Amino acid sequence: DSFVIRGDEVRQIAPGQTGKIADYNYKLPDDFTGCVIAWNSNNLDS
Amino acid sequence: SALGKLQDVVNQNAQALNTLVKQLSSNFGAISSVLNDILSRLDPPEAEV
Amino acid sequence: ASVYAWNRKRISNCVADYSVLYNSASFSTFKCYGVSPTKLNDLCFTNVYA
């Protein structure tokens, strides 16, 4: 799964985690998830 | 009170059933003893534990 | 108020919508312990302390 999100929201992308962007748009299912890799690249953004 | 044995077995069975029913009031380490509460005020991830 | 003299206000006799304040993204961190945020609306409590 590929997407770019603000660094502040990176914690929300976790199994069973709750956040507005997380809950509404993309939330990991409350069970096994393989792995989550995040490297913030805000320089490329904006 | 001649019939001691009979009353003894009756009392023992009633006592076992009563303590089994009473064991439902125990928290056992949960946040509440009744199930509908720990289902009504928690998320499935922690309601599970 | 200052942290050492934290200000406590009692809350009672009202209909309280947690969902709207939770929906607002103004609050950076929202951690509820022992109670689920989504089901906060359904519950009824004796009183609240803020």
From Swiss-Prot, chain B:
Stretches of the chain forming a coiled coil according to its record: 7-49
Covered range of the whole protein: 943 to 991 of 1273
Organism: Severe acute respiratory syndrome coronavirus 2 (2019-nCoV)
Effect after changing Q12H: In strain: Omicron/BA.1, Omicron/BA.2, Omicron/BA.2.12.1, Omicron/BA.2.75, Omicron/BA.4, Omicron/BA.5, Omicron/BQ.1.1, Omicron/XBB.1.5, Omicron/EG.5.1
Phenotype for L39F: In strain: Omicron/BA.1
Described function: Subunit of the fusion protein that is processed upon entry into the host cell. Mediates fusion of the virion and cellular membranes by functioning as a class I viral fusion protein. Contains a viral fusion peptide that is unmasked after S2 cleavage. This cleavage can occur at the cell membrane by host TMPRSS2 or during endocytosis by host CSTL. In either case, this triggers an extensive and irreversible conformational change that leads to fusion of the viral envelope with the cellular cytoplasmic membrane, releasing viral genomic RNA into the host cell cytoplasm.
Consequence the record notes for mutating S40A: In strain: Alpha/B.1.1.7
Protein name in the entry: Spike protein S2'
